[PDB]
Design a binder for this molecule. Structure first.
Ligand code: HEM
Length: 152
């Protein structure tokens, strides 16, 4: 899998819209992740005390973490697949410190795609959803290969 230039344009066009409100996107994505997949919340010592959606929405610290995560993702996307240097540290921490299964990265991808669809219907039609899925799959494929190297 390599994305075409066309596919990259679609991804980065929608991403530039996300960047108008990184914090609101990060909140919506983590919340969707935690509600859809409660096991994910449990990996976060920082957030596992949050028991309701309203509590999640009211946490400034969760918003802060959403900004962190999305900002790293944005830097990866803008490398258009040349993201070896960005991925290495992220794979290392996620495999060896945070203990995040690959499957949980698939759930994370699903959350991103869902939120982009809610917030950007006109810039996120089928073609753009496809391209974004391909980009997120490429990310996951590469992280997975690092996990295997490390024996996760
Ligand atoms: C698009 C996928 C993801 C990106 C870009 C991302 C990004 C980040 C970044 C940039 C950090 C801070 C630096 C570091 O520790 O490496 C971080 C920390 C962390 N990530 Fe992720 N992450 C992703 C997926 C996940 C998922 C799916 C989970 C759990 C289901 C997870 C759990 C965590 C945890 C527990 C921390 C440590 C948070 C703390 O206690 O401060 N991440 N992530």
């Amino acid at each position: 899998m390599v994305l075409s230039e066309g596919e990259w344009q679609l991804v980065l066009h929608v991403w530039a819209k996300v960047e108008a409100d990184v914090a609101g996107h990060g909140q919506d994505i983590l919340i969707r992740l935690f509600k859809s997949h409660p096991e994910t919340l449990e990996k976060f010592d920082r957030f596992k005390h949050l028991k309701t959606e309203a509590e999640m929405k009211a946490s400034e610290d969760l918003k802060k973490h959403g900004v962190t995560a999305l900002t790293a993702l944005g830097a990866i996307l803008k490398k258009k697949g040349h993201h070896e240097a960005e991925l290495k540290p992220l794979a290392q921490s996620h495999a060896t410190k945070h203990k995040i299964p690959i499957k949980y990265l698939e759930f994370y991808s699903e959350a991103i795609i869902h939120v982009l669809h809610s917030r950007h219907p006109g810039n996120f039609g089928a073609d753009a959803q496809g391209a974004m899925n391909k980009a997120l799959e490429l990310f996951r494929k590469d992280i997975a290969a690092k996990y295997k190297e490390l024996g996760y």
